Coordinates of C-alpha atoms in Angstrom, one line a residue:
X1 CA 75.6 78.6 83.6
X2 CA 77.3 81.4 81.7
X3 CA 80.2 83.3 82.8
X4 CA 80.8 86.9 82.1
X5 CA 82.3 88.1 78.7
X6 CA 86.1 88.3 79.3
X7 CA 86.3 85.7 81.9
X8 CA 89.9 84.6 82.8
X9 CA 90.4 81.0 82.3
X10 CA 93.7 79.2 83.0
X11 CA 95.7 78.1 85.9
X12 CA 98.3 79.3 88.6
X13 CA 101.9 78.3 89.4
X14 CA 105.1 80.0 90.5
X15 CA 108.8 80.3 89.4
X16 CA 110.1 78.2 92.4
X17 CA 107.8 75.4 91.7
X18 CA 107.9 75.0 87.9
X19 CA 111.2 76.4 86.5
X20 CA 114.0 74.3 88.3
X21 CA 117.2 75.8 89.4
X22 CA 118.8 75.9 85.9
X23 CA 121.0 79.0 85.3
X24 CA 119.7 80.8 88.3
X25 CA 122.2 82.9 90.2
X26 CA 120.8 82.9 93.9
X27 CA 119.2 80.5 96.3
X28 CA 115.8 81.4 97.7
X29 CA 114.8 80.1 101.2
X30 CA 113.3 76.9 99.7
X31 CA 116.5 76.4 97.5
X32 CA 118.6 76.8 100.7
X33 CA 116.6 74.6 102.8
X34 CA 116.5 71.7 100.6
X35 CA 120.3 71.8 100.3
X36 CA 120.4 71.7 104.1
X37 CA 117.7 69.1 104.9
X38 CA 116.7 67.2 101.8
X39 CA 115.1 64.6 104.1
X40 CA 112.3 67.0 104.9
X41 CA 111.0 66.9 101.4
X42 CA 108.8 64.0 100.2
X43 CA 110.9 61.4 98.4
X44 CA 114.0 63.7 98.5
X45 CA 112.8 65.8 95.6
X46 CA 113.7 69.4 96.1
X47 CA 113.4 72.4 93.5
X48 CA 116.6 71.7 91.5
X49 CA 114.6 70.4 88.5
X50 CA 111.1 70.9 89.6
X51 CA 108.8 70.7 86.5
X52 CA 111.6 72.0 84.2
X53 CA 109.8 75.0 82.9
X54 CA 113.2 76.6 82.5
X55 CA 113.3 74.5 79.2
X56 CA 109.7 73.8 78.6
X57 CA 107.8 77.0 79.0
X58 CA 107.2 77.5 75.2
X59 CA 105.9 74.0 74.6
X60 CA 103.9 74.3 77.8
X61 CA 102.1 77.6 76.9
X62 CA 101.4 76.1 73.4
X63 CA 99.8 73.1 75.2
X64 CA 97.8 75.4 77.5
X65 CA 96.2 77.5 74.9
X66 CA 95.5 74.4 72.9
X67 CA 93.8 73.5 76.2
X68 CA 91.6 76.5 76.0
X69 CA 93.5 78.7 78.5
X70 CA 93.4 82.5 77.9
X71 CA 95.4 83.5 81.0
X72 CA 98.5 82.3 82.9
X73 CA 99.8 83.1 86.3
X74 CA 103.4 82.4 87.3
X75 CA 106.0 84.4 89.2
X76 CA 109.2 86.3 88.7
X77 CA 111.8 85.1 91.2
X78 CA 114.0 87.7 92.8
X79 CA 116.7 85.2 93.0
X80 CA 116.9 84.7 89.2
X81 CA 116.2 88.3 87.7
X82 CA 118.5 90.2 90.2
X83 CA 122.4 90.1 90.3
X84 CA 123.2 92.6 93.1
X85 CA 120.3 92.8 95.7
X86 CA 121.7 96.1 97.1
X87 CA 121.4 97.9 93.7
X88 CA 119.0 95.5 92.3
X89 CA 121.1 94.9 89.1
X90 CA 119.7 92.9 86.3
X91 CA 120.9 89.3 85.6
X92 CA 121.0 89.2 81.8
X93 CA 120.2 85.7 81.6
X94 CA 117.3 86.0 84.0
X95 CA 115.9 88.8 81.9
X96 CA 116.0 86.8 78.7
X97 CA 114.2 84.0 80.6
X98 CA 111.3 86.0 81.8
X99 CA 111.0 87.6 78.3
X100 CA 110.7 84.1 77.0
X101 CA 107.8 83.7 79.5
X102 CA 106.0 86.9 78.7
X103 CA 106.7 86.7 75.0
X104 CA 105.5 83.0 74.9
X105 CA 102.3 84.0 76.7
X106 CA 101.5 86.7 74.0
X107 CA 102.6 84.4 71.1
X108 CA 100.0 82.0 72.3
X109 CA 96.7 83.9 73.0
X110 CA 97.5 84.0 76.7
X111 CA 97.3 86.9 79.1
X112 CA 100.5 87.1 81.1
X113 CA 99.7 87.5 84.8
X114 CA 102.7 88.0 87.1
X115 CA 103.4 87.7 90.8
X116 CA 106.6 89.2 92.2
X117 CA 107.0 87.2 95.2
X118 CA 105.9 83.6 96.0
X119 CA 107.5 82.2 99.3
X120 CA 110.9 82.8 97.6
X121 CA 112.9 85.5 99.4
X122 CA 116.7 85.1 98.7
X123 CA 118.5 83.2 101.3
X124 CA 121.1 86.1 101.5
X125 CA 118.6 88.7 102.7
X126 CA 117.6 86.4 105.4
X127 CA 121.1 85.8 106.5
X128 CA 122.2 89.4 106.3
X129 CA 119.1 91.4 107.3
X130 CA 116.6 88.9 109.0
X131 CA 114.6 88.8 105.6
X132 CA 111.1 90.2 105.7
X133 CA 111.8 91.4 109.3
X134 CA 113.9 94.1 107.6
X135 CA 112.5 97.3 106.2
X136 CA 115.8 97.6 104.1
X137 CA 114.7 94.3 102.7
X138 CA 111.4 95.9 101.9
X139 CA 113.0 98.7 100.1
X140 CA 115.2 96.3 98.1
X141 CA 112.0 94.4 97.3
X142 CA 110.6 97.7 96.0
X143 CA 113.8 98.1 94.0
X144 CA 113.3 94.5 92.5
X145 CA 109.6 95.3 91.5
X146 CA 110.5 98.5 89.6
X147 CA 112.8 96.5 87.4
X148 CA 110.2 94.0 86.5
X149 CA 107.8 96.9 85.7
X150 CA 110.5 98.6 83.7
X151 CA 111.6 95.5 81.9
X152 CA 108.2 93.8 81.3
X153 CA 105.6 96.6 81.7
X154 CA 105.1 97.0 78.0
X155 CA 103.6 93.5 77.8
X156 CA 102.5 92.5 81.3
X157 CA 99.6 94.6 82.5
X158 CA 98.5 92.3 85.3
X159 CA 100.7 92.3 88.4
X160 CA 100.7 90.9 91.9
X161 CA 102.9 91.8 94.6
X162 CA 102.6 88.6 96.8
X163 CA 101.1 85.3 96.8
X164 CA 99.5 84.8 100.3
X165 CA 101.8 86.9 102.5
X166 CA 100.0 85.5 105.5
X167 CA 101.3 82.1 104.5
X168 CA 104.8 83.4 104.6
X169 CA 104.3 84.9 108.0
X170 CA 102.8 81.5 109.3
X171 CA 105.3 79.4 107.5
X172 CA 108.4 81.4 108.7
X173 CA 107.5 82.5 112.1
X174 CA 104.6 80.4 113.6
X175 CA 104.1 76.8 112.1
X176 CA 107.5 75.9 111.0
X177 CA 106.8 75.1 107.3
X178 CA 108.9 77.8 105.7
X179 CA 112.5 78.3 106.5
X180 CA 113.8 79.6 109.0
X181 CA 110.8 77.8 110.6
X182 CA 111.1 79.5 113.9
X183 CA 108.2 80.2 116.3
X184 CA 108.2 83.9 117.3
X185 CA 104.8 85.9 117.4
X186 CA 106.6 89.3 117.6
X187 CA 108.6 89.0 114.5
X188 CA 105.4 87.4 112.9
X189 CA 103.3 90.5 113.5
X190 CA 106.2 92.7 112.4
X191 CA 106.6 90.6 109.2
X192 CA 102.8 90.7 108.8
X193 CA 103.2 94.6 108.8
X194 CA 106.2 94.8 106.4
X195 CA 104.6 92.7 103.6
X196 CA 101.5 95.0 103.9
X197 CA 103.9 97.9 103.7
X198 CA 106.0 96.3 100.9
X199 CA 102.7 95.8 99.0
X200 CA 101.8 99.5 99.3
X201 CA 105.2 100.7 98.2
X202 CA 105.2 98.4 95.3
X203 CA 102.0 99.7 94.2
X204 CA 103.5 103.3 94.4
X205 CA 106.4 102.5 92.4
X206 CA 104.1 100.8 89.8
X207 CA 102.0 104.0 89.6
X208 CA 105.0 106.4 89.7
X209 CA 106.3 104.9 86.5
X210 CA 105.9 106.1 82.9
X211 CA 102.3 106.1 81.7
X212 CA 103.0 103.3 79.2
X213 CA 104.5 101.0 82.1
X214 CA 101.7 101.9 84.5
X215 CA 98.5 101.6 82.4
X216 CA 97.7 98.1 83.8
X217 CA 96.2 96.7 86.9
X218 CA 98.2 95.9 90.1
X219 CA 97.1 94.0 93.1
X220 CA 98.0 91.1 95.5
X221 CA 97.0 87.5 96.1
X222 CA 95.3 86.9 99.5
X223 CA 92.9 84.8 101.1
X224 CA 89.3 85.2 102.3
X225 CA 88.1 81.7 103.2
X226 CA 85.8 82.0 106.1
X227 CA 86.5 80.8 109.5
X228 CA 83.2 79.0 110.5
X229 CA 82.4 79.0 114.2
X230 CA 81.7 75.4 115.7
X231 CA 78.3 76.7 117.0
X232 CA 76.5 79.9 117.4
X233 CA 77.5 80.3 121.1
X234 CA 78.9 83.8 121.7
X235 CA 82.3 82.4 122.5
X236 CA 82.7 80.2 119.4
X237 CA 81.3 83.3 117.5
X238 CA 84.2 85.3 119.1
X239 CA 87.0 82.8 118.2
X240 CA 85.8 83.0 114.6
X241 CA 85.8 86.7 114.5
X242 CA 89.3 86.7 115.7
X243 CA 90.4 83.9 113.3
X244 CA 88.8 86.1 110.5
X245 CA 90.5 89.4 111.7
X246 CA 94.1 87.7 111.7
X247 CA 93.9 85.2 108.9
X248 CA 91.7 87.3 106.6
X249 CA 91.1 90.9 107.7
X250 CA 94.7 92.0 108.3
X251 CA 95.8 92.0 104.7
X252 CA 92.4 92.3 103.0
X253 CA 91.9 95.7 104.7
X254 CA 95.5 96.9 104.1
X255 CA 95.1 96.1 100.4
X256 CA 91.5 97.2 99.8
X257 CA 91.0 99.8 102.5
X258 CA 94.5 101.2 103.2
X259 CA 94.2 100.5 106.9
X260 CA 94.8 97.6 109.3
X261 CA 91.6 96.5 111.2
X262 CA 91.1 98.7 114.4
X263 CA 90.0 95.5 116.3
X264 CA 93.1 93.5 115.5
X265 CA 95.4 96.4 116.1
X266 CA 93.8 96.9 119.6
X267 CA 94.4 93.2 120.4
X268 CA 98.0 93.0 119.1
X269 CA 98.7 96.1 121.3
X270 CA 97.0 94.7 124.3
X271 CA 99.2 91.5 123.8
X272 CA 102.4 93.7 123.6
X273 CA 103.2 92.5 120.0
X274 CA 102.1 95.4 117.8
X275 CA 104.4 96.1 114.8
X276 CA 106.7 99.0 114.8
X277 CA 104.9 101.5 112.6
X278 CA 105.5 105.1 111.2
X279 CA 103.0 107.7 110.4
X280 CA 104.4 108.2 106.9
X281 CA 104.3 104.4 106.4
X282 CA 100.7 104.3 107.4
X283 CA 100.0 107.1 104.8
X284 CA 101.5 105.2 101.9
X285 CA 99.5 102.1 102.8
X286 CA 96.4 104.4 102.9
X287 CA 97.4 106.0 99.6
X288 CA 98.1 102.6 97.7
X289 CA 95.2 100.3 97.3
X290 CA 94.9 97.4 95.0
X291 CA 93.4 97.9 91.5
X292 CA 92.1 94.3 92.2
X293 CA 92.8 90.8 93.8
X294 CA 93.2 87.2 93.4
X295 CA 91.9 85.1 96.3
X296 CA 93.1 81.5 96.8
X297 CA 90.8 78.7 98.0
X298 CA 91.2 75.1 98.7
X299 CA 89.4 74.5 101.9
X300 CA 87.2 76.0 104.6
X301 CA 88.4 76.6 108.1
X302 CA 86.3 75.9 111.1
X303 CA 87.2 77.1 114.6
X304 CA 85.9 77.1 118.2
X305 CA 86.7 78.9 121.5
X306 CA 89.9 77.5 123.0
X307 CA 89.6 74.3 125.0
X308 CA 92.5 75.6 127.2
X309 CA 93.3 79.3 128.1
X310 CA 97.0 79.3 129.0
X311 CA 98.4 81.6 131.8
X312 CA 101.8 81.4 130.2
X313 CA 102.5 81.2 126.5
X314 CA 106.2 81.0 125.4
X315 CA 105.4 82.8 122.1
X316 CA 102.4 84.7 120.9
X317 CA 100.0 83.1 118.5
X318 CA 96.6 84.0 116.9
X319 CA 95.6 80.4 118.1
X320 CA 95.5 81.9 121.6
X321 CA 92.0 83.0 120.6
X322 CA 90.7 79.8 118.7
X323 CA 91.2 76.1 118.1
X324 CA 90.7 74.0 115.0
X325 CA 87.2 72.4 114.8
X326 CA 86.4 69.2 112.9
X327 CA 82.8 69.0 111.8
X328 CA 81.3 65.6 112.1
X329 CA 80.3 64.3 108.7
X330 CA 82.1 66.9 106.6
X331 CA 83.4 65.9 103.2
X332 CA 87.2 65.3 103.0
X333 CA 90.1 64.6 100.8
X334 CA 92.0 61.9 102.8
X335 CA 95.2 62.5 101.0
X336 CA 95.6 65.9 102.6
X337 CA 93.1 65.6 105.6
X338 CA 91.4 68.8 104.1
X339 CA 87.7 69.4 104.2
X340 CA 85.9 69.8 101.0
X341 CA 83.3 72.6 101.2
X342 CA 82.6 74.3 97.8
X343 CA 79.9 76.6 99.3
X344 CA 82.7 78.7 100.9
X345 CA 83.4 80.1 97.4
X346 CA 80.0 81.6 97.4
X347 CA 80.6 82.9 100.9
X348 CA 83.9 84.4 99.8
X349 CA 82.1 86.0 96.9
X350 CA 79.5 87.6 99.1
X351 CA 82.1 88.8 101.4
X352 CA 83.8 90.7 98.6
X353 CA 80.3 92.0 97.5
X354 CA 79.4 93.2 101.0
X355 CA 82.7 94.1 102.7
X356 CA 85.3 95.0 100.2
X357 CA 83.4 97.5 98.1
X358 CA 82.7 94.8 95.4
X359 CA 86.0 95.6 93.9
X360 CA 87.2 93.3 91.0
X361 CA 88.6 90.1 91.9
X362 CA 89.4 86.5 90.7
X363 CA 89.8 83.0 92.3
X364 CA 93.5 83.2 91.7
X365 CA 93.9 79.5 92.9
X366 CA 91.6 76.4 93.2
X367 CA 92.4 72.8 93.0
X368 CA 92.6 69.4 94.6
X369 CA 95.8 67.4 95.3
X370 CA 95.9 63.5 95.1
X371 CA 98.7 61.1 95.3
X372 CA 99.1 57.7 93.6
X373 CA 97.5 59.2 90.4
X374 CA 99.1 56.3 88.6
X375 CA 96.0 54.3 89.7
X376 CA 93.5 55.9 87.4
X377 CA 95.0 55.6 84.0
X378 CA 92.5 53.7 81.7
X379 CA 93.7 51.5 78.8
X380 CA 95.1 54.6 77.1
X381 CA 97.5 55.9 79.7
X382 CA 95.4 59.1 80.4
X383 CA 94.6 59.7 84.1
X384 CA 90.9 59.7 84.5
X385 CA 90.9 62.1 87.4
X386 CA 87.0 62.5 87.7
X387 CA 87.5 63.5 91.3
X388 CA 89.2 66.7 90.1
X389 CA 86.5 67.4 87.4
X390 CA 83.9 67.0 90.0
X391 CA 85.9 69.0 92.6
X392 CA 86.5 71.9 90.1
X393 CA 82.9 71.6 88.8
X394 CA 81.4 72.1 92.4
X395 CA 83.6 75.0 93.1
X396 CA 83.0 76.7 89.8
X397 CA 79.2 76.3 90.5
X398 CA 79.3 78.2 93.6
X399 CA 81.6 80.7 92.0
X400 CA 78.8 81.1 89.4
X401 CA 76.1 81.6 92.1
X402 CA 78.4 84.4 93.6
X403 CA 78.6 86.2 90.2
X404 CA 74.8 85.9 89.9
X405 CA 74.5 87.4 93.4
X406 CA 76.4 90.5 92.2
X407 CA 80.1 89.4 93.1
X408 CA 82.5 91.4 90.9
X409 CA 84.6 88.3 89.9
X410 CA 86.5 88.1 86.5
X411 CA 88.3 84.9 86.5
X412 CA 89.0 81.3 87.7
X413 CA 92.5 79.9 87.7
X414 CA 93.1 76.3 88.6
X415 CA 96.0 75.4 90.9
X416 CA 97.6 74.2 88.6
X417 CA 98.2 73.4 84.9
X418 CA 101.2 71.0 85.1
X419 CA 101.9 68.9 88.3
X420 CA 104.3 71.2 90.1
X421 CA 106.7 71.1 93.0
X422 CA 104.7 71.5 96.3
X423 CA 107.4 72.6 98.7
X424 CA 108.1 70.1 101.6
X425 CA 105.4 67.9 100.0
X426 CA 107.2 68.1 96.6
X427 CA 105.5 65.7 94.2
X428 CA 103.6 63.7 96.9
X429 CA 100.2 65.1 95.9
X430 CA 99.6 66.2 92.2
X431 CA 97.3 69.2 91.4
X432 CA 97.9 69.5 87.7
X433 CA 95.3 69.3 84.9
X434 CA 98.3 68.0 83.0
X435 CA 100.4 65.2 84.5
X436 CA 104.2 65.6 84.7
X437 CA 106.2 62.6 85.0
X438 CA 109.1 63.9 87.2
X439 CA 111.8 61.7 85.7
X440 CA 111.4 62.4 82.1
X441 CA 109.5 65.8 82.3
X442 CA 107.1 64.6 79.7
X443 CA 103.6 66.1 80.2
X444 CA 100.3 64.2 79.7
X445 CA 97.1 66.1 79.9
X446 CA 94.5 64.4 82.3
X447 CA 90.7 64.1 81.9
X448 CA 90.3 67.4 83.8
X449 CA 92.4 69.2 81.0
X450 CA 89.8 68.3 78.4
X451 CA 86.9 69.0 80.6
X452 CA 88.5 72.4 81.6
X453 CA 88.9 73.0 77.7
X454 CA 85.2 72.8 77.2
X455 CA 84.5 75.0 80.2
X456 CA 86.9 77.8 79.0
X457 CA 86.3 77.4 75.3
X458 CA 82.4 77.8 75.7
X459 CA 82.5 80.1 78.6
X460 CA 80.0 77.8 80.3
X461 CA 79.5 74.9 82.8

């Protein structure tokens, strides 16, 4: 079971979740929200210290390469690197921090891969402009990106504009799990649009720059997990087509095909919720397509035709057109109430092959989150997280079958190397290959670390 020459091996993370709030000028939404309602976060642990990567990034990266990693994805937080948002002025301390990150990657044998935005808009832009709802905010985001390209381009040649913008859209405006946690379909569709726009314009800026700061790849981190219909009835079929259009197609098509999907646009319009567009905006989207993509996957999604069609809906939602469906007998991680279905990785792979011009891609995230990990430490104090080895194994296997079937995939990144701060859930469920003890910030590789070393070191299952 041999992976391509050059396969990415490593894990994913973000600034907000690993760094801590050390020395960081601004508050992002999550920073803010924790300060306001600490009681919303598991065990009261917000992002102030997170997994202390502000201090430990060098030792970390030396641990990870020793652990067979050749790539590493984190993010650059707008709230640390940028002093004046309106001019996008550089915070010198932020600059010297992200240089530590990049420099450490290279020193260690590790490909620096960098996302620009991970659920971490600055609170100020929200308060001032309505955040991603604002097309000035978008320009300001453009401004921010150029700085990163200008300051780190000479050594980071792998760039991603967002991690899962759809999750930002749902979190903030539909399901109340990102601040401001309102429920408003119209803003949501408009935010949907603006991130798609901000992606395009960011890609522009990247490609406009000096040949030596624009000779790498740029893309974005999305999702293509299939929405499986409950049955083959035309109606269940129909809910699953919508669930895919919204959840999957919106961004996949903007990024790869330079267009929103005609069908979804037609629906949104019919429902009086289409985004305010601009023909020049639409051209930039068309003109700026990803060199490539990461796709994240933890769990399938299953849907059916709605049990109830409402005459009145207070706010618009894509769930007007489908319901969750639970499949009897499915395999589940109880801790999270999330289905385990590793076959979807293959489906995702074939979906790239057959619907997204087989353009290059990696699984930018994959992992399983458990709690009470304490309980699996053998005599030696090392967590024997067999469940994670198996989980990863089973996903990697299908990833392999996808490659064998022709799927242009070039890497697997585990979410995540060191147990990190999972938002509202904070440290409730651990996902790391390497344990972090959140009191002492001492790391302790788990069984999966050493299993994943073999996998990466021999390029095989």
